[PDB]
Structure 1
Amino acid sequence: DTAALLERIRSDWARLNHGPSAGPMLTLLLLQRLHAALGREIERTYAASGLNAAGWDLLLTLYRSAPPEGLRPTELSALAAISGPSTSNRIVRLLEKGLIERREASIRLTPQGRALVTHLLPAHLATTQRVLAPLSAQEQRTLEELAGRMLAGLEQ
């Protein structure tokens, strides 16, 4: 908790120097902690509906980005916020739960899946704005730029 013990972690890294700065290690630690904390907040929107983060992401991505016929698996992953083994049986599970359907693959929301997102979105949108709220307009755009810029350097 806090920046309480960033100083402790900073001085701990300094002891490893035996005769450069700790910024990069601290910055990544902070983003990692931020990723977890953001997870917690965003989760509340849909935890009671029985969804997890991978499930909500897939549903929401279809809601915003699927055309009426749906999205194919390549497209879908390219448009979703979350990828990786974290998302292994998300489609299987959501099919199971009646919230998405297939057609010819090609995936879309069922009516129950769409009403569900429609009902949660206002709170998801509220939480999204609330977690960024400590930051101004510049700052938010700056965060945007730096993240895109870092992210660009790694996308290969």
Structure 2
Amino acid sequence: NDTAALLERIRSDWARLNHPSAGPMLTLLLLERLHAALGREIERTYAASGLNAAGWDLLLTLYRSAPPEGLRPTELSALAAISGPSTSNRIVRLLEKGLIERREDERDRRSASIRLTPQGRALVTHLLPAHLATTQRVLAPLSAQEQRTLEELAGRMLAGLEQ
């Protein structure tokens, strides 16, 4: 009843219908199922804090990439790992939570630089050990060499889509 069993079934079903390869469809189904399973695991680190993936990405980005003065929105967006429609209003949402700050009482207020508040920094510091343990855990089935091979293969696919 696991994904491997389902994928052999789906492969068998396509072969029956096609007797037009289902090969690529099945490879991407595996990657899609893996993405979903990873997300259910990774998000447990920050779920009890009220953060979604978009919010955690922003906080981590400030934590690892912001200089002391903070990051203005264009730079912050470029250094964040998630881009797209799911990022809508994540700055507003994290401001209302009190986890990030910026001086709204100045001109160019929309471009004002953003920083972690003491609470935001404390939250990231609190949660990061479980994130590091979890990201390591979900890759543990693979050896060092296998993780490197995986990154290279996945990287070449992504390069093809971005070129």
Which TM-score applies when normalising by structure 2?
0.88
Contact 2:3 2:33 in 1 (8 A): no
Deviation at 1:46, TM superposition (A): 0.8
Deviation track 1:83-112 (CA, whole Å, cap 9, x = no partner) reads 211111111100000001124622221111
Give the percent of matched residue pairs that are identical in Structure 1 and Structure 2. 99
- The count of corresponding residues between Structure 1 and Structure 2 is 155
Deviation at 1:152, TM superposition (A): 1.0
Deviation at 1:77, TM superposition (A): 2.3
Stretch moving more, 67-76 or 89-98: 67-76
Runs of 4+ in 1 over 3 A off after TM superposition: none
Q: Which residues of structure 2 form unaligned runs of 5+?
A: 104-110
Q: 2:152 and 2:74 mapped to 1: Cα distance?
A: 26
Which TM-score applies when normalising by structure 1?
0.91
Contact 2:11 2:22 in 1 (8 A): yes
**Structure 2 residue 29 is matched with structure 1 residue 22:** no
Give the corresponding residue for 1:141: 148
Deviation at 1:39, TM superposition (A): 0.7
Q: 1:76 and 1:145 mapped to 2: Cα distance?
A: 27
Q: 1:17 and 1:73 mapped to 2: Cα distance?
A: 51
Q: 2:49 and 2:63 mapped to 1: Cα distance?
A: 17
Deviation at 1:82, TM superposition (A): 1.3
Deviation at 1:118, TM superposition (A): 0.5
Decide whether aligned partners of structure 1 residues 146 and 72 sit closer, same or farther in structure 2, where only a CA change above 3 A counts. Answer: farther
Stretch moving more, 143-152 or 99-108: 99-108
Decide whether aligned partners of structure 1 residues 122 and 8 sit closer, same or farther in structure 2, where only a CA change above 3 A counts. Answer: same
SS at match of 1:4: helix
Q: For 1:4-153, what aligned pairs fall within 5 Å after superposition?
A: 4-17=5-18, 20-103=20-103, 105-153=112-160
Q: 1:55 and 1:107 mapped to 2: Cα distance?
A: 14
The RMSD of aligned alpha carbons is 1.6
Decide whether aligned partners of structure 1 residues 13 and 120 sit closer, same or farther in structure 2, where only a CA change above 3 A counts. Answer: same
Deviation at 1:52, TM superposition (A): 1.1
